[PDB]
Amino acid sequence: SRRRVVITGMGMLSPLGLDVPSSWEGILAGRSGIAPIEHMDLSAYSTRFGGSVKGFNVEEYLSAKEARKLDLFIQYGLAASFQAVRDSGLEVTDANRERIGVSMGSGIGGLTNIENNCRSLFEQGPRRISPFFVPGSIINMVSGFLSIHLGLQGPNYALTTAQTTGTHSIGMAARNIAYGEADVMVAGGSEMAACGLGLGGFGAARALSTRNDEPTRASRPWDRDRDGFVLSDGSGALVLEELEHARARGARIYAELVGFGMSGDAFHMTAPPEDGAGAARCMKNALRDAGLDPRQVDYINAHGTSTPAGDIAEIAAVKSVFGEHAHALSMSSTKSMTGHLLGAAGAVEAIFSVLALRDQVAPPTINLDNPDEGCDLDLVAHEAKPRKIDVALSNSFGFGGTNGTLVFRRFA
Amino acid sequence: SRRRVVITGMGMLSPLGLDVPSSWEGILAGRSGIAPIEHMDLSAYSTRFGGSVKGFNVEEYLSAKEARKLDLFIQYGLAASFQAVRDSGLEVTDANRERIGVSMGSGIGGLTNIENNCRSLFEQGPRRISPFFVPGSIINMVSGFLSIHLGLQGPNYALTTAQTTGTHSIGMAARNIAYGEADVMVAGGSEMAACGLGLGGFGAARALSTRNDEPTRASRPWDRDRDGFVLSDGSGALVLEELEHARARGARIYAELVGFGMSGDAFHMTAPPEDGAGAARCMKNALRDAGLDPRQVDYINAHGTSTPAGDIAEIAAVKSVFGEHAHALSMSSTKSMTGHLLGAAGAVEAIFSVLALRDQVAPPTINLDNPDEGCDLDLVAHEAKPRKIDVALSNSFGFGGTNGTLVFRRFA
C-alpha cells in the first residue's frame, strides 16, 4: 500500500552554477547563463550560443583517469548525483544498499563521444575507435557508474523521453519507493548535446533561437518575438526517500513529492497540439494522483521552451486545467535564464520547484517584454515574486508527444 | 492489492524470421540466424558476421516517405508493435485510448543515422544534416511514432538499460497496468547496431566472437571454446493487458506475467561478478514479486551471451537461488541461435519464454559441444526438449551491472 516520498538531498550543474545554491542565487537575481559557445568553431552554424556549464572541475568528484573515459553527460550526472547524496547525509551500508537505487536519464546521451569516435572511424578506420566508446557514451551509465562508486544495489535503470526525461525519471523513481521496491532513489537527468550533431541537428529542424547577436535575450518564453529554444547543458539529481525512513534517521526534508502524471499527445513527432490537450490530461493525472483541488496549486514551473507553438499550448493547457484559478497561481519558465537542458530540464526544474517551496518565491520569466496573444497569466515577468506557495508543479513536454508532471508541496 | 497482467499479442523481427511463428520455428529446429554482414565493407574489422534481419519490407508498415525519416531501429520496433497490436485483436476507441500506453526501448538507438549524418557533417558541414535527424534517431520515437499512428494517449516512455532494455521495458509496463495507470501497454525493444560504430565499438573492447570462419558456431553459451557475444538486429513487442479487460473482449491470452525483479550488481562497468550475486538478488526479487517459491520454476531463458565471464556468473546465480532444484529446471540461451539483440534481447526472449509455456518445450542451447567447468546444469544442449513448464523466467544482465528478471506462468 502506497508510501509517502520526500526530497532529502539535491545536486546540480547548470549554465548558472556548479551546485544548487549558486544556480538558485542566479534564478532569483534573474541572471542569464546563455553566452556564445567557445569549446568549438560554430561560424558554419545558424546558432552559435548556448547554456554552457562554466568551469566544471570533474577532479572534485573523480580521478582524471576515470573522467577521460566518460562523456561530459555522464560526468555531469555523477557530479549532481554525488552532490545530492552528500546533501542528503545518507550513509550506504550492507543494511540499506539493496534498498537504494538510481534512475538518471538523458535525451541524447554521449553525442560528443559518438561524434569524435565517428570522426576517428571515417578519417582513420575502425581500429581508432576507443575501447571505452560504448560504456563511456550510453545513457544508462550515469546509473551504473553511480551504483559502482556508492554500492547502490537497488533498482538501476534509465529513461530517455527526450525533453521529458528529467520529470519521468524523478516520477518513476518515486513510484519505486511508494510501492515498496526501494526506500531511496537517486533520480534526475543530465545532458551535453553542445556538439556539431546537436547544434547542427536542431539547426536542420529550424528548432533553435538564431538570436546570435543578443544570446542572453534569445530564450524569451511567451514573448511575441521568441524564435525557438536555447540549447543548454547540465545535470539535476534528487534523493527521494520514503518518509518514515527519512524521519527514522533525522533527515532534513525539503518537501514532499505528492503526485506524478504522464500522457501522450498522440498528435505530432515534434509539434505540441495548439490546445495543450495532452499536457492538460497529464496535469490532471498528476493532481488526481496527489488528491488535490487544482485551486491548491500556487506555482507552476512551466516547460516554457521559448517556441511559438510550445509556449501557447502550455497557456491553453493551464487555463483548461485550472479554469479561473489559472489567473491566481504564478507560472514561470526558468529556461528564460538556464535555457533548455533537454533531458536534464525536468531535473533542474524539479529542484527550482522544491526551492520555490522552501523560500516561498516564484522565480522570474526574464525577457518577457511583450507577452503574446493570449499569454495573460501571472508569468512572473522580469523579477522574482515573493508569495505563498504550498503546492508547486513542474511540467515537461518532449518529442513523441510525451508529457510528464510532478507535484511537490510543503512538508510539516 | 494489484491487478493481474496477461500477454494477448506478440510481434518480432529477428535473425530467424520476420515474425513470431517463423522466428519460433527457427528456435525449436535449432537453426542459426548468424551470417557474414553484407552491403557493408567490414575488411578492417576483427568481426565480419552477426544476426541481420533478412528481407524486411517496411512498406508493409509505413509509406516510403515516413520510412525514409526513421532510423532502421525505429522501423523494426514499429513493425514489432504493429504485429503485436494486430496479434492482440485490440480495438482502440475514444473510450479506451487514454488507457493504452507504450514503453518501447533501445540500448543504443539510431547509430546508423548518426553515422550517415556524421558523414554529411564532416564532408560538407552542418547544412547537409537531415531536418528529421533528431526525431528520426532518438530512442523514445518508437513509443512516439506508435502512439501517433494508433492514437495511444496512455503512459508514453522508453527505457535504455543496455542489454537489459527489453526486460525492464516489459516489467515496468506491467507495473503501469497492475497499479491502474493503463489497461493496455505495448512494451519491448528494438536495436540496429550493425553499423561501423557498433561492430567497431564492441570490436575495440574485444567483447565480440571473431569466429569469422564458422559464423553459425560463434554463439556457444557455456561451451568452453566461446570467445564473446554475436551482435544481432531486430525487435520484440508484447501487448500487456489487465486480466478483466482481456476477458471482457474475449482476447486469446498467451500467458500471465506474474513477476518482475530488478537489481544492481554495483561491481563493474561491463563484467558481472564471478558469483552472479546481483543476478541472484534480481531472480529472488522477481520470485518474491510473483509469490513463487524457487522450486516452482521449470524453464529459464538465460541472458546466456557467450562471453566467458557472463555465462559462468549466471550458472553460479542459478545454483545460489534454486539450490537443490537448480538441476531439475531447464535453462537454455536462445542467443546460441539469434545472437544478442542488445536492447531487444529481453523482448524476443520474453516472447520465446511465453511460447515455451504455450507449446510445453525448452528451446535448445545449440553449439553446447563441450560444457565448461561447473556448467553441469540442464542447459538443453543441441536439441529442443519437450517437458512440463508451468513457470518460466527470462533473465537480462547489462553494462553498468543492471539486472532484470521476468516471471511468466501458464494461464487457465
Ligand SMILES: COC(=O)c1cccc(NS(C)(=O)=O)c1
Ligand atoms: C516501477 O515500479 C512500481 O512499483 C510502480 C508502481 C505503480 C506504477 C508505476 N509506474 S511507472 C513508475 O513504471 O511509471 C510503477
